[PDB]
């Protein structure tokens, strides 16, 4: 068909015996593709004592293209809940922590921080401290053991905290009246919260955070980043698949 | 009194796609409304209602001189990881998956002087031979001819024809399921200008719109970066 292009809007051609659908597009559904615990991030827990580095659940950064990174940066604004599932890969001899309680405490956008000691468990001597803000209360704590536990993991819901009617991925402007190099693409708290992990462990194991993004709503499309170099002109790119040849 | 149950052997395991959520640790969190327009539910949706420039040579367009004729103008192995279809939206979307089942459309936006005419030919070569290399060989296949001058661009729908209900979003060594063929455009009439002086060459943009029957099935993690 004769196209009078230039005015944005694409242009189709439609052959004969047009092909019937099947699959129904379905597998390309935004909310659907994003409702699955991904393995994103991975950190080191805290010793009960001393001061913590409040971890922040901001999954709008990307880079290692594990097909979840690109997908989040295909939209401009994003609004979804969250759900996590911490696990904890032992790093040495998995029989050196005969208990390991881990005070996974989640915090909502805006919750204070400064967490020094204030708790202490008294029993026959010794007494082991717990992080002040770590204890239980307002913001949901989960205590799971790292011994004999046939899955040194947990997991829960975390409804959308942030103040913004929707989460802006890439911001063009700044985050604070201190037009500073950093607050560019920052914007005050374009995120899902934090988490403080404290356990008698901290060493002898890591974690593997995870996100389940139920009710993912995406707005304002954006271009989708290639993720693979360019090949040799005229031809195909050849990745070893299920199929392949031999 | 106490119910009787039996754990499956699997039991206390992970499952990275359990159809069912987790325990709601924070509740009653009412959420504020959203007034932003340009929202989407489906990804196919955006690549259907939107083209993207295919990368020929390093640019999104071929040339047309008054010294061509026989030679092919543009060629590429119709598979979602073939050179040209590398940078496109439609092709870059694909790699979150494993399969596609769609005929594609291309639009040829001719950009030469308004005193230029080029006339022309496109052709789809189903897989068999080893790339016809002259229209006289290619015209015996499915092709379309077009005359710039008053049009100001054109559209060609590279259909879907193959024995498999879904093909591969990933290219690999010659399979009956990788390659759907080639896409070719030819100089059915070497370009012309007011003066060969002022107007040397004409160009043409190669934009890729997702076809009207096209869809991606099966999400898949990303391999290595290669």
């Amino acid at each position: 068909v004769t196209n009078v292009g230039e005015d944005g809007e694409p242009g189709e051609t439609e052959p004969r015996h047009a092909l019937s659908p099947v699959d129904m597009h379905v597998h390309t559904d935004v909310s659907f593709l994003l409702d699955r615990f991904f393995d994103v991030e991975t950190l080191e827990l805290s010793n009960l004592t001393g001061s913590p580095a409040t971890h922040v659940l901001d999954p709008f950064g990307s880079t290692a293209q594990l097909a979840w990174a690109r997908l989040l940066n295909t939209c401009t604004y994003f609004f979804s809940d969250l759900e996590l599932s911490i696990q904890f890969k032992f790093t040495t001899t998995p029989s050196s922590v005969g208990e390991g309680f881990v005070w996974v405490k989640w915090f909502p956008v805006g919750a204070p921080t400064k967490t020094t000691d204030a708790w202490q468990l008294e029993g026959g001597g010794n007494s082991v401290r717990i992080q002040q803000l770590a204890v239980a209360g307002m913001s949901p704590t989960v205590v799971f053991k790292i011994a004999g536990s046939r899955s040194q993991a947990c997991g829960f819901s975390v409804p959308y905290t942030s103040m913004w009617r929707v989460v802006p991925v890439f911001y063009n402007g700044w985050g604070a009246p201190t037009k500073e190099k950093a607050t560019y693409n920052w914007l005050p708290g374009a995120h899902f919260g934090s988490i403080l992990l404290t356990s008698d462990a901290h060493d002898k194991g890591g974690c593997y955070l995870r996100y389940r993004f139920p009710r993912a709503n995406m707005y304002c499309p954006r271009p989708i980043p290639p993720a693979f170099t360019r090949p040799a002109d005229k031809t195909r790119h050849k990745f070893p698949t299920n199929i392949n040849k031999q | 009194a106490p119910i009787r149950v039996v754990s499956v052997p699997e039991s206390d395991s992970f499952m990275s796609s359990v159809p069912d959520n987790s325990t709601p640790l924070y509740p009653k969190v009412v959420v504020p409304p959203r007034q932003v327009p340009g929202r989407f539910t489906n990804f196919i949706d955006v690549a259907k209602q939107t083209y993207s420039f295919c990368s020929i040579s390093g640019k999104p367009y071929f040339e047309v001189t008054n010294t061509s004729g026989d030679e092919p103008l543009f060629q590429m192995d119709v598979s979602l990881s073939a050179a040209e279809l590398h940078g496109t939206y439609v092709a870059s979307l694909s790699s979150f998956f494993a399969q596609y089942r769609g005929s594609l459309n291309f639009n040829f936006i001719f950009t030469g002087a308004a005193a230029t005419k080029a006339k022309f030919l496109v052709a789809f070569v189903p897989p068999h031979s080893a790339a016809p290399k002259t229209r006289d060989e290619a015209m015996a296949c499915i092709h379309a001819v077009w005359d710039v001058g008053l049009n100001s661009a054109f559209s060609f729908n590279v259909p879907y024809s193959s024995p498999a209900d879904f093909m591969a979003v990933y290219s690999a060594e010659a399979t009956v399921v990788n390659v759907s063929g080639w896409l070719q455009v030819y100089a059915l009439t070497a370009l012309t200008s007011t003066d060969i002086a002022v107007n040397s060459k004409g160009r043409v943009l190669v934009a890729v719109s997702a076809g009207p029957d096209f869809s991606l099935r099966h999400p898949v993690d990303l391999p290595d970066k290669q």
């Binding site: 819901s157 009710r215 | 959420v31």
Partner: peptide
């Protein structure tokens, strides 16, 4: 989305998720 089990509403949708307006 990927929650097609008839136990998802053990926790009613208030505790489960959020709400808009």
């Amino acid at each position: 989305g990927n929650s097609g089990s008839i136990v998802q509403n053990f926790y009613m949708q208030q505790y489960q998720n959020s709400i808009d307006a």
